[PDB]
Design a protein around this ligand. Structure first.
Ligand SMILES: [Cl-]
Length: 145
């Protein structure tokens, strides 16, 4: 469990650094990196300190898989010609729509389990993504011309 947590933290840190380097569709890439860094922040605080339930282990594995899926999409979209093909085949122009929904859904479940089982604090503000994604997609579309 300690190794799984460390892996998730490292993977989130790598995704944020990669997002900051992406040359095209920067609003969407930077939003993904910002969101991922925000999710790993309480995990990093937890790491600096219980036996997980069945529900916690599966939530942790789903979160790890969603981050791996995001890392795979960042790799694909680092090449400009892959962005162009995706955008032309897309109606809403949102690069990370599926990855973003998986991350938000799993985080809702995972954060609650960490608060109940592992004494993770309840944050003054929880972690509107779909609406932000359309705005970012529109701004990136204009810059991609
Ligand atoms: Cl661009």
């Amino acid at each position: 469990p300690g190794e799984n947590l460390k892996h998730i933290i490292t993977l989130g840190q790598v995704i944020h650094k990669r997002c900051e380097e992406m040359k095209y569709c920067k609003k969407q890439c930077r939003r993904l990196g910002h969101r991922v860094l925000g999710l790993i922040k309480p995990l990093e605080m937890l790491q600096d300190q219980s036996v997980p339930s069945e529900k916690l282990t599966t939530a942790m594995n789903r979160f790890k898989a969603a981050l791996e899926e995001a890392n795979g999409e960042i790799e694909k979209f680092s090449n400009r010609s892959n962005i162009c093909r995706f955008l032309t085949a897309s109606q809403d122009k949102i690069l990370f729509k599926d990855v973003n929904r998986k991350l938000s859904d799993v985080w809702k479940e995972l954060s609650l389990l960490l608060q109940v089982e592992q004494r993770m604090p309840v944050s003054p503000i929880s972690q509107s993504w779909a609406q932000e994604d359309q705005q970012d997609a529109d701004e990136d579309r204009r810059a991609f011309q």
